[PDB]
Design an enzyme around this catalytic site. Structure first.
Site, PDB file in Angstrom:
ATOM      1  N   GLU A   1      -0.121  -7.732   0.744  1.00  5.11           N
ATOM      2  CA  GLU A   1       0.548  -6.522   1.219  1.00  5.11           C
ATOM      3  C   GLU A   1       2.063  -6.604   1.230  1.00  5.11           C
ATOM      4  O   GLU A   1       2.719  -5.655   1.684  1.00  5.11           O
ATOM      5  CB  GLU A   1      -0.009  -5.983   2.536  1.00  5.11           C
ATOM      6  CG  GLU A   1      -1.316  -5.238   2.341  1.00  5.11           C
ATOM      7  CD  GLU A   1      -1.155  -4.015   1.448  1.00  5.11           C
ATOM      8  OE1 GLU A   1      -1.855  -3.918   0.409  1.00  5.11           O
ATOM      9  OE2 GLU A   1      -0.299  -3.168   1.781  1.00  5.11           O
TER      10      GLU A   1
ATOM     11  N   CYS B   1       5.173   2.422   7.645  1.00  5.56           N
ATOM     12  CA  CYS B   1       4.891   1.250   6.839  1.00  5.56           C
ATOM     13  C   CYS B   1       6.001   1.027   5.834  1.00  5.56           C
ATOM     14  O   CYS B   1       6.509   1.952   5.190  1.00  5.56           O
ATOM     15  CB  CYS B   1       3.534   1.334   6.140  1.00  5.56           C
ATOM     16  SG  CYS B   1       2.202   0.626   7.176  1.00  5.56           S
TER      17      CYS B   1
ATOM     18  N   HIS C   1       0.796  -1.217   0.000  1.00  2.00           N
ATOM     19  CA  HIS C   1       0.000   0.000   0.000  1.00  2.00           C
ATOM     20  C   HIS C   1       0.835   1.276   0.000  1.00  2.00           C
ATOM     21  O   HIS C   1       0.275   2.341  -0.269  1.00  2.00           O
ATOM     22  CB  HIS C   1      -1.070  -0.007   1.094  1.00  2.00           C
ATOM     23  CG  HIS C   1      -0.550   0.176   2.480  1.00  2.00           C
ATOM     24  ND1 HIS C   1      -0.247  -0.884   3.301  1.00  2.00           N
ATOM     25  CD2 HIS C   1      -0.338   1.295   3.213  1.00  2.00           C
ATOM     26  CE1 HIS C   1       0.152  -0.427   4.475  1.00  2.00           C
ATOM     27  NE2 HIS C   1       0.106   0.892   4.449  1.00  2.00           N
TER      28      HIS C   1
END
Length: 168
Positions: free
Chosen positions: A56, A137, A32
């Site tokens: 992911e 992230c 993402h």
């Protein structure tokens, strides 16, 4: 175990987060944070990059050596339950913030309506500075096995619980 400077040198700003050079040609990140509508990554055209992504986890394999300063290290699909990993968080300033996490089970998880193949963990309060707890992230989850560092996931989600996306 303290991550050495060469290990931190693999952690690289990417998209809306970070990623990690596993070797001179292999870069991993969380799907993402990957930018869309681009024609290149790190200046290399799409046609020169092999993509392997699911759940992911995104891997890029560049056709040219991008980081020949680095040795190739082992990427594993998660780690044994109970492993203490370090999440190699970097700030924009360049400050390094290793965060210790006790890992739990590898599992299939729906996170905000997206399929995530990941590993849960709990921050190890006793191994982080007091008050040092939960744009990060893509940061890698690493652990030292014998003489070698292993990377086993990329940061994907959190609430004192975290999830890294995993891929073999």
């Amino acid at each position: 175990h303290h991550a050495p400077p060469t290990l931190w040198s693999r952690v690289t700003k990417f998209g809306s987060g970070w990623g990690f050079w596993v070797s001179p040609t292999v870069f991993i990140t969380t799907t993402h944070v990957v930018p869309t509508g681009v024609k290149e990554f790190f200046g290399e055209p799409l046609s020169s990059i092999a993509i392997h992504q699911a759940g992911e986890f995104t891997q890029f394999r560049f056709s040219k050596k991008m980081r020949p300063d680095l040795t190739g290290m082992v990427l594993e699909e998660g780690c044994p339950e109970g492993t203490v990993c370090s999440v190699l968080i970097k700030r924009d300033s360049g400050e390094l913030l290793p965060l210790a996490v006790r890992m739990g089970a590898i599992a299939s998880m729906r996170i905000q309506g997206r399929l995530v193949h990941g590993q849960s963990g709990m921050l190890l309060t006793g191994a982080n500075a007091k008050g040092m707890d939960l744009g990060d992230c893509g940061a890698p989850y690493v652990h030292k096995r014998g003489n070698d560092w292993v990377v086993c996931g990329v940061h994907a989600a959190a609430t004192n619980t975290v999830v890294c996306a995993v891929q073999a």
